Design a protein around this nucleic acid. Sequence first.
DNA 1: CCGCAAGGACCGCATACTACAA
RNA 2: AUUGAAAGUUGUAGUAUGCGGUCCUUGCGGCU
Lengths: 152, 146, 322, 331, 330, 184
Amino acid sequence: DIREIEQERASFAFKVVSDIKDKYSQNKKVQGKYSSYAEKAPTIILNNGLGATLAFFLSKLEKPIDDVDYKSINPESFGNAENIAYAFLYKHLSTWLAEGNGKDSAFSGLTNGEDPLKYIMEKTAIDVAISTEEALSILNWIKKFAKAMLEE
Amino acid sequence: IREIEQERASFAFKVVSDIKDKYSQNKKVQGKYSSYAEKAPTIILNNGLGATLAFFLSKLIDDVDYKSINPESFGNAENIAYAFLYKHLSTWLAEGNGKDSAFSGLTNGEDPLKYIMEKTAIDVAISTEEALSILNWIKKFAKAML
Amino acid sequence: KAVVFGLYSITPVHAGSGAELSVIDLPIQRERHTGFPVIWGQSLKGVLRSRFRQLELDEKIEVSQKWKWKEKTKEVLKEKADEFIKKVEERKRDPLLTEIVFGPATDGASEHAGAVSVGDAKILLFPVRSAKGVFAFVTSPIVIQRLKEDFELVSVELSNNETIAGNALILNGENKVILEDIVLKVKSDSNVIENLVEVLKTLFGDNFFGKPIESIKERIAIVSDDVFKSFTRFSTEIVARVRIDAEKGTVARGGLWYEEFLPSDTLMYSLIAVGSPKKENLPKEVDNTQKIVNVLKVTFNNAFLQIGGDETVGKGFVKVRA
Amino acid sequence: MFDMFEKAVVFGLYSITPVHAGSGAELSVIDLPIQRERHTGFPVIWGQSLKGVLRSRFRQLELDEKIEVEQKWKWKEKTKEVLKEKADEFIKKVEERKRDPLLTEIVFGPATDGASEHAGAVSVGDAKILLFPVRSAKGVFAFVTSPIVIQRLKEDFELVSEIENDIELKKVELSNNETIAGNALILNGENKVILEDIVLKVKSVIENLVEVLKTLFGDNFFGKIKERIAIVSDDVFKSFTRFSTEIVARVRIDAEKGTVARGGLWYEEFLPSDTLMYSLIAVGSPKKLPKEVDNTQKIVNVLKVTFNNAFLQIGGDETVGKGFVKVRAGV
Amino acid sequence: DMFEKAVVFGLYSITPVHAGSGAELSVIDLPIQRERHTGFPVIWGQSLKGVLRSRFRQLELDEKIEVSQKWKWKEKTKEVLKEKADEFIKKVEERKRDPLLTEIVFGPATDGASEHAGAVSVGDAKILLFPVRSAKGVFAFVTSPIVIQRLKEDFELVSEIENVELSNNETIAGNALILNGENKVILEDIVLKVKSDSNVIENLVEVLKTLFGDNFFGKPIESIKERIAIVSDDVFKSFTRFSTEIVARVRIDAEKGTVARGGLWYEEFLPSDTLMYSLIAVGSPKKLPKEVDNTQKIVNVLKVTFNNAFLQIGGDETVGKGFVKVRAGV
Amino acid sequence: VYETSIRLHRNYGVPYIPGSALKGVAKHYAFSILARENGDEILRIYESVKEDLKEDYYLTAAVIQELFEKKFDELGAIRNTRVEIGDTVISVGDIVKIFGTQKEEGSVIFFDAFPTPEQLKDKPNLELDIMIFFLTVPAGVEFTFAVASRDLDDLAEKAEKLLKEALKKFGVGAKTSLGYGRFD
DNA sequence: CCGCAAGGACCGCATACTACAA
RNA sequence: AUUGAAAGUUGUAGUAUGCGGUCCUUGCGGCU
């Protein structure tokens, strides 16, 4: 009995949104920023592209957009609420494209563990299109749970 | 497949009656519940059951628990009607008419949204069909009572 | 002796019953006491007789030689053979072996009786949509008890929420089966399904109408009597048909009605009770019961028949095992 | 052992527009669903729907003398050749749409007025799904089928084999997360396929299936596929046919207010384009006769020439471009 | 089966077109209609017929329909309905029925639905040329093998009524798109290697000449040929998904002149310069004046009425969306 | 990702003004004139609607909008109320038909507005401005506008005069409170 | 650089809704 | 040596005809 990706999307989205609410229950600013950035993210992707969106997040963290592995990014090491949220969103989005909801889940990502931004700047347009659609799909679910759970 | 229809009809009559009882003088609440009941299957058809439940969630959190919802504690008719429909739909999928009846739910007390996240695609499909069926019965009694 | 005819539907079947009480315009034949779908002995006999008759007239009947009915008619009726053969061509009578096996055509009814008694085709397995394994072959204790009784003489406890089912129907770890839109909890059982399959194998052989009977075992679901009855009454195909007035390109006046169909993948069985051939001066190769039984088996085993109405819109086709 | 028929023809049906073979309105979110086999959930076109379509086309062709038998078929002349004396009164019935032209009634049966005279000569089987189009992350879409469909195809070949008395005319196992698929569907360096919302692992059959499709429909496939064929498990295939059909909201707009009118909003289901279905058309001896069509073989020939490579419209909503299919009729 | 004539309606978008499919719980609130298994943008036959019918109705009620002389429906209804003509006119005026010729061509309104079927079949509008931004050549008219294959099949249907292989990094394109001595084309975010071919584009232009002539919706057909590109199916799918128009709209609260709460949403549009086509099949009317009493007559009325006409399709009409140029190729 | 943006045509790159904005600014300008000239009476007649919104000009404008958007079945009381802009007489009932309601489509089509081709040839259609840099359309750029009647009422003339005034007094686009978006 | 982050109307209406012989 | 023998509710029949996912809505405010 298999599962659909939608189930994994919803599961992953709930998990990462609950993780923020847990680590920053007293910080409404961090929660409010993450929700704003999750809401903003799909529109940036449609207008500017997924690669430009991932790079846009990294630039907010003042990281070199060419020399950063997503796993190395630890959101709990930033001061302002903005960079904490950007780091979370970048981390969650990259983790989804890279690992999905786990190696033994119904969806283990698209980039086979490779950093999504590095993947984009290395692969073909069709690969990027498939990842772009998937990025939009996971963000839709992140937005859903952020809207209901995260407070301002 | 016939007894399950009777069970659905029994639940539907009960929840709509509760709506009409608590908000007898409030036609706005009754009318809102009716509209949302009519729109609900459409939202499910175009977005899936998971997204629809999530959409209801946004009309209300710490945890996803339909039991903890309190529809009467809300300020406006829109949120009151949404909270009621959400709880009704969730209660049916999780509890049915109770464990003293033929149909006692599909999810065994678990919130349907979390249930969808955890179980198989088959489990989600039957929950989707069942959700559409109970809303279809709620729509019947809504049009006749509200 | 007797022959058990297994009937497996490969297209939907409409054995019409005018007397059946229903909200449907054209309902299918059903048993009065059980409400189960059925094919009347008389409907089946008519089908069997028509096929047999065509084969005899076309010299395709084998008795292990080619049966020549006009030659046999002359060595049987002697001086009255020519007028009989004339009646056959005039469709007033049927060819020799046909009348021996199924009885004279109505014109000659009083001469002698038909050797065979064609029993109702009783339902055995009824297909129901399953969330796992596409669909289940559904049956009930009352059905199994009827089958066992019919076979024993010719030679289970379940609640409304329970089912004894094969592995291919069961949701992994949940111990549940989902038939259409309802959920049944799996009752642990060791040999009931296995016993049923063995009975089926003893009557119809190793191959189940073109597939191993072992494959069927994994998709059999035994449900309670009330649940089985419910499915056989409310899961049959109910189809709207219309007639179009091509002058207007819209549905003609009085051109809408509803018709019921027994689904494909239904298993039924009919006991054909064979008595001694009753015609006088029989040819030797068909002068007793065993010889009639043998011809019946060879003629209809692995045959394809059309039962009921709606032949030209592709309904009523069944595979036969005898 | 299928002696009631003598020959059979497989009618391949490829949709080039969405198709709505209807079953009627329901009290449901989908107000107008398509025809389905209830115990499998598979989409079908009932034989009576297809027969009505075939009959109407054949009838119009005979009335316009476009029917080819062996030269042109003049039904009025052949009517006079068969009915002789009372032929004139029969032709008058046809012009009044009380009866149908000679060959039409021979093949499909008499119009409702003469129903009791004789039965039709051909049996129009239900159309069943063979290939169902499903969106794919790579390769745009896949022609999806399953073992149970392949099995039913083989069994129908056994029917044809029994009817034509040709014994010469007469194994796929897959897990639910597995697929046997063409190269165009497979993601770059992953050995996986994503159909709709399901990830399927590629398994190391298609070439043989294509060879079968090449037999029935000729060397060309309806004038056009192995690279986008995907074989999935029976239950996965079933879910696709039930939940990947087109569901469309339609409205009626008040011509004066420019707004949706009351009783003017409903949801309607469509079988997608690029769907391959097939029906078994069995032919028996005519039961009504001119020498040109006095036996089974001659009737088969007429059917093959008339409908092969032809376009038909099946189901409702013809006026909004639905139900258009291309037909291939092979023996 | 009464279809004797088929005409192709070319639809060239002048403004962005929104053929809606209902709201969705996603970033794109109001998406455009798409064929599900391909994801290709479409305009369903019923959406197009409603617009054609509405236009034809307004023109018939204003005596602007020509059959080469004017059409009087009230006078032609008196000749058809006779005694019940005055009753039918009152129905049309009460908007319970539609004028005579409209009901003949498109079928009766609700009250007369069972009387007869519509004479014409309005096919789904299919994508033929999709405008894609291009590094060289400003923008290209892009199509794919699937589209061309469908175009071919639709011709096999039309003729019956009247009685290329590319990899993902390859393109067949006109010279105006190709970079200076690089043999590459850049369409949106995709870099494509030019594949040498000498038939595909040429035959495609020939098809357009057969249908629409030298006048390609306000421009010479020769101008278009230099900017036509064929790409792989995967690439075309990506273009029609990520290069549609996604427009942010708002509703302003007059109180402070700011965006109202829940007053921000996104709508999808087919861009301007999108070429779609629909098969309009015409059969013998089933209801009738001798002016329009056969297939050929209906075709002539359909052509002249809609050829070179400007039509609004889909939603957002009063904010200037959905306006296309129509060419009726017979 | 630029943090600022501007509506540029997808295929041709020219800046332009969506019909939605043109229709919007014309309707909000209609709201304004009705508020400054007939505010006291409108707030008095529709005291029930006023309570829903809530008491100055900005409360009146919101009340007029709600009347036109939500409670348009109740506009019978002030349907005959007229406004001048500038020498033409436009009634509330005319405004209802021009922009339409949820129960009836607007009788006037508001098309997109585009700069003439001659200017694309002769002068820069874009120039950088500072708040953070952002793209703007320079002063002196001529645009072509159009409105069309789609009903027998023929209200495109009133809509034209209403839109012309809106583009002069209100302006269109962002940062109107700083003088941006004005037309001559 | 910051903020937002849909809502209601319509909700299948009407017609055909057995005919006839054997 | 049974009110018994003999008899296919079958044949003909397109769930179809009519129906725009449309109407109302300034990517803006100046804040974090």
